[PDB]
Amino acid sequence: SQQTRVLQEKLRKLKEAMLCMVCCEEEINSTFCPCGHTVCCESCAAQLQSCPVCRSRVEHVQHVYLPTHTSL
Amino acid sequence: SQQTRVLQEKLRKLKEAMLCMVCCEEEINSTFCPCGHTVCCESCAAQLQSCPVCRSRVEHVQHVYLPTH
Numbered sequence: 001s002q003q004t005r006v007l008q009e010k011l012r013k014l015k016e017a018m019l020c021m022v023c024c025e026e027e028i029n030s031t032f033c034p035c036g037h038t039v040c041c042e043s044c045a046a047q048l049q050s051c052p053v054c055r056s057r058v059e060h061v062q063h064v065y066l067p068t069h070t071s072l
Numbered sequence: 073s074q075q076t077r078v079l080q081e082k083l084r085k086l087k088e089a090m091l092c093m094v095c096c097e098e099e100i101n102s103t104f105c106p107c108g109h110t111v112c113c114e115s116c117a118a119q120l121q122s123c124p125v126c127r128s129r130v131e132h133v134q135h136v137y138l139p140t141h
């Protein structure tokens with residue numbers, strides 16, 4: 001039905017929100033400290049000197065283990 | 073259809089996985105440092121000495137801003 005298409009869109013947007021905002025290919029699993037923005041995979045986070053959301057300097061990157069994480 | 077029911081179930085399980093493991097009522101927004109387990113809301117994380125997942129000592133709690141919030 002049309003409702004199947006609406007639910008597919010909600011699921012797609014929720015899954016896209018869990019993907020790295022820089023590469024769009026890997027799951028988010030890293031936090032920029034101290035600002036706390038959690039928007040990148042570990043490979044993109046290692047290459048950024050400032051946060052891509054708020055431009056605060058990245059003092060260090062904290063790996064995060066989230067219950068939503070998935071793998072092959 | 074049955075497909076609508078399958079998608080509703082996937083959405084519900086994904087949303088439940090974003091809720092605090094201690095109170096089950098608020099969204100997860102805090103990380104235990106240095107282990108990195110991100111399983112609690114701020115109020116539940118504030119009072120724990122050890123991580124509820126791995127038992128590592130909690131040196132501090134980092135607030136996290138997630139795009140799914």
Ligand SMILES: C[C@@H](O)C(=O)/N=C\c1ccccn1
Nearest residue numbers: 022023024043044045047048
């Ligand atoms: C565009 C995206 O794939 C990407 O940026 N990849 C690596 C990188 C390089 C510089 C900064 C952050 N990430």
Ligand SMILES: [Zn+2]
Nearest residue numbers: 020023041044
């Ligand atoms: Zn990335």
Ligand SMILES: [Zn+2]
Nearest residue numbers: 035037051054
């Ligand atoms: Zn930031």
Ligand SMILES: [Zn+2]
Nearest residue numbers: 092095113116
């Ligand atoms: Zn809680």
Ligand SMILES: [Zn+2]
Nearest residue numbers: 107109123126
């Ligand atoms: Zn832990």
